[PDB]
Amino acid sequence: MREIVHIQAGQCGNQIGAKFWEVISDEHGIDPTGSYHGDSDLQLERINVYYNEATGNKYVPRAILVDLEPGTMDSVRSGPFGQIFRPDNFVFGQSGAGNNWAKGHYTEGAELVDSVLDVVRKESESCDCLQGFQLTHSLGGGTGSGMGTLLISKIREEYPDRIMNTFSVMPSPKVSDTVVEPYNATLSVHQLVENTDETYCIDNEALYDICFRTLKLTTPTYGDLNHLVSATMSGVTTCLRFPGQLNADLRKLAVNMVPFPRLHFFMPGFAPLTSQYRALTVPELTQQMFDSKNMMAACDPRHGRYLTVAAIFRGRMSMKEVDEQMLNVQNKNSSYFVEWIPNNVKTAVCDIPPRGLKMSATFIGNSTAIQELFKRISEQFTAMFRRKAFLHWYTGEGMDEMEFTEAESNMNDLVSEYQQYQDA
Amino acid sequence: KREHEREVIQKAIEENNNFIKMAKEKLAQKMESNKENREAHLAAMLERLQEKDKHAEEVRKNKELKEEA
Ligand SMILES: Nc1nc2c(ncn2[C@@H]2O[C@H](COP(=O)(O)OP(=O)(O)O)[C@@H](O)[C@H]2O)c(=O)[nH]1
Ligand SMILES: [Ca+2]
Ligand SMILES: [Mg+2]
Secondary structure, eight states: OEEEEEEEEHHHHHHHHHHHHHHHHHHTTBOTTSBBOOSOHHHHHTGGGTEEEETTTEEEEOEEEEESSSHHHHHHHTSTTGGGSOGGGEEEOSSOOTTOHHIIIIIHHHHHHHHHHHHHHHHHHTOSEEEEEEEEEESSSSIIIIIHHHHHHHHHHHOTTSEEEEEEEEOBTTBOSOTTHHHHHHHHHHHHHHHOSEEEEEEHHHHHHIIIIISOOSSOOHHHHHHHHHHHHHHHTHHHHSOOSSSOSHHHHHHHHOSSTTOOEEEEEEEOOOOOOSOOOHHHHHHHHHSGGGBSSOOOGGGSOEEEEEEEEESSOOHHHHHHHHHHHHHHSGGGBOTTSTTOEEEEEESSOOTTOSOEEEEEEEEGGGHHHHHHHHHHHHHHHTTTTTTHHHHTTTOOHHHHHHHHHHHHHHHHHHHHHHHO | OHHHHHHHHHHHHHHHHHHHHHHHHHHHHHHHHHHHHHHHHHHHHHHHHHHHHHHHHHHHHHHHHHHHO
8 A cells, every 4th residue: 555645736737637637547447426437456456556545435536736826726626537636635826826936936835835735744644655746747837836846845844755756847938838937947957856756857849849740730739738748647657556566666666767866857758659540569669669759858869878767568468579679679779778777777567558559658768868958948047047037027026146046057067967977 | 945935035025015115205205395395486486476565565655755745
């Protein structure tokens, strides 16, 4: 009974978080009313990891919904699986964050953070053995970015010995709401560097490119982008939700994936990405899984080296052929895997496939090429900060320019740290 | 970090209050200074008119002196 507490904060965190619960509830046979209607005991074997069991054999997600505006959470409550969430787990304010990290982190979110921690405490007290927490949020806004990192710092203070995991959506000018997104992202990244054990870097630039270039969607929407995130989130949590031997819990995943404490930002990948009835072979899954076009971080893996890799295959397939194909990719491209971490690629297989697919593969890579993402944010940050542009939105909330300078230096140190192990 | 969080929000409160304080004080200084200036201009105007009245009394008094002779 290794429970995980889920938190979704802000517009992006709740919209993506809602889709995630919609996807995995279908995989576990849980209907919108919380009643189980599956046909396999494998669905309920690890059901308590994400779901609480209530009176009447009801499965209530262990999810806490946080926002500084009621708008998105009202849509979630009126959505397909809206009624499955615990009503007391809806914690929301009214002022909003205005896409401002300072408002979420220092002024508006500070007023609300204690009430969120009360719900976190209530959920944790009923856990037989709490693994830790997973947070879904964006780094470009105000609530998920500012208040989300405030929650992480306070949760770590109250639960220092638990694993902190995040799905963090990186901003991009291609899919952009405000010009201040590089400011909010840079401030949030330093918080993640210190206070998370695992962060899946989901880049809206990559999601847009996959929808446009690969899926042939001329005008991608957020719903189209979130479909890729839902599939990715389901894949990366497969080892947590189903019986298995590899990366079965958050801490064991962290031990396998994080060789250095600050370098814990992962590149996720998914296959297939089909724009559909054709069967996909095991060699095809492996090639697409490692292909840059299937990466969700918009970083070129060939520009860096893999520190560690986690691979998950879902469906009824030949595990012998899976081992052969996995060894084939490593042996044919060994230059992109660091030689000082032997056998850094670990492969898991799950029998239950995702909805609508016979075969699927999920990629989790700790590559030094993720520095390209942080360099991109750093360049956009500096372009404005050198002229102190748009800073008044933040100094008006009590922040000083020195805090921005330290955040800028912290991320450049992170970039330099990645470059250290790419040449070693 | 908790100490820094307290200092940021207290800094935002202090700057907002100081802005309100400066706005209130600047306006009160302007309204008082304007009131004194306008009253001074009206006082100068009335004083000149009173001096005209004093001149008129002198003129009329001067006529009575010559009428006696
Ligand atoms: N992938 C994805 N990104 C989103 C979504 N909504 C907002 N974003 C991104 O998140 C950033 C805005 O943050 P947002 O969540 O709206 O601000 P918040 O509600 O105050 O936390 C921008 O960079 C958007 O591109 C969504 O539904 N899906
Ligand atoms: Ca208030
Ligand atoms: Mg928004």
